[PDB]
């Protein structure tokens, strides 16, 4: 995948966004912007040019599942990769992510190596 791929990192905790952005940088992805919930995310997405979303699940205003469904049903954004992040792998939550079209699913906390593994799985399926 292209090093300049533009990421949106979505989490209501600024520290978690900083951490994910730093892991992305460690992997060579420097083109990263942030959003604090699903509403904020959709606002920022209107700027265009985004190529990959990493989203938390539990957020106020619009949560990560609501965000994912909106992106998947959107005329312009329907095929955007979305890596969903959760605090605990539970069957119900994983199955909800699958039904909604999550590109990937990773449980916090995770290493750069795990992040690279999950990104690569998504790139491979999508032919990126």
């Amino acid at each position: 995948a292209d090093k300049e791929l533009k990421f949106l990192v979505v989490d209501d905790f600024s520290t978690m966004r900083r951490i994910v952005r730093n892991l992305l940088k460690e992997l060579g992805f420097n083109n990263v912007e942030e959003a604090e919930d699903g509403v904020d995310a959709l606002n920022k997405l209107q700027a265009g040019g985004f190529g990959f979303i990493i989203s938390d699940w539990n957020m106020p205003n619009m949560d990560g599942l609501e965000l994912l469904k909106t992106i998947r049903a959107d005329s312009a954004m329907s095929a955007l990769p979305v890596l969903m992040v959760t605090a605990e792998a539970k069957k119900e939550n994983i199955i909800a992510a699958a039904q909604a079209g999550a590109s990937g699913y990773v449980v916090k906390p995770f290493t750069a190596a795990t992040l690279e593994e999950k990104l690569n799985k998504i790139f491979e399926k999508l032919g990126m």
Binding site: A89, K90, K91, I94, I95, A97, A98, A102, G104, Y105, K118, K121, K125
Partner: peptide
């Protein structure tokens, strides 16, 4: 069933 469900999903 968790890591195994994840595999099935390609997650």
């Amino acid at each position: 069933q968790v890591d195994d469900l994840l595999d099935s999903l390609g997650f």
